[PDB]
Design a protein around this ligand. Structure first.
Ligand SMILES: NC(=O)[C@]12CCC[C@H](CCC1)C2
Length: 209
């Protein structure tokens, strides 16, 4: 049972700008997704300070980077607070309408796409490198869901029958054909070292057979 939703017009416009603007510095997508994971991990950590049972769904707080050259996917996994179904539908837990307005007002005044995270909509930088993004998520207060979009103005949400996650979020980037450098170990290592040196959770780069 799959539900299909239209993006709000402002979010569709954000996504088309990310997809269509000539902009070479695409590697910032990974910094933005790792920063989102760190934010989600901070949230579950904070809740656990007054209620240890919040970690009954998993005590480890970490970020895993999983490249798969056969599937042409880069997956960013975190064990943060996750998202409810309502969060997914409401722009993946962001205030994306007001964030997009500010971001586009910053671009016309000289900002560039790399500053997207200052406007709270860094998730959508995934579309710099991915033709399709799948988000699997599990929040303590809801069931496990899969969100998916290839842009084009719509996204889907369905209950996820896949491998149970416990708690957190998995962002699966189905990479564009010309963006496979982001599956190479040395390239991912370089980006993490350059942009994510002060992320306070272990980032494990998985290797492939
Ligand atoms: N959080 C981590 O695992 C890192 C992130 C930056 C690159 C490496 C150096 C120590 C911190 C690993």
């Amino acid at each position: 049972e799959v539900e299909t939703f239209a993006f709000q017009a402002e979010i569709a416009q954000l996504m088309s700008l990310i997809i269509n603007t000539f902009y070479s510095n695409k590697e910032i997508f990974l910094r933005e997704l790792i920063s989102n994971s760190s934010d989600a991990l901070d949230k579950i950590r904070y809740e656990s300070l007054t209620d240890p049972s919040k970690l009954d769904s998993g005590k480890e707080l970490h970020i895993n980077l999983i490249p798969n050259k056969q599937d042409r996917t880069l997956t960013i996994v975190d064990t943060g607070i996750g998202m409810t179904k309502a969060d997914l539908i409401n722009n993946l837990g962001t205030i994306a309408k007001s964030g997009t307005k500010a971001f586009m007002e910053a671009l016309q005044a000289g900002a560039d796409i790399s500053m997207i995270g200052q406007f709270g909509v860094g998730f959508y930088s995934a579309y710099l490198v991915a033709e399709k993004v799948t988000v699997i998520t599990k929040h303590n207060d809801d069931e496990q869901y899969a969100w998916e979009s290839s842009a084009g103005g719509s996204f889907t949400v369905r209950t996820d029958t896949g491998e149970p996650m416990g708690r957190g979020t998995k962002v699966i980037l189905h990479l564009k054909e010309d963006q496979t450098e982001y599956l190479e170990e040395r390239r991912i290592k370089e980006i993490v070292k350059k942009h994510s040196q002060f992320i306070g959770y272990p980032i494990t780069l998985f290797v492939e057979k």
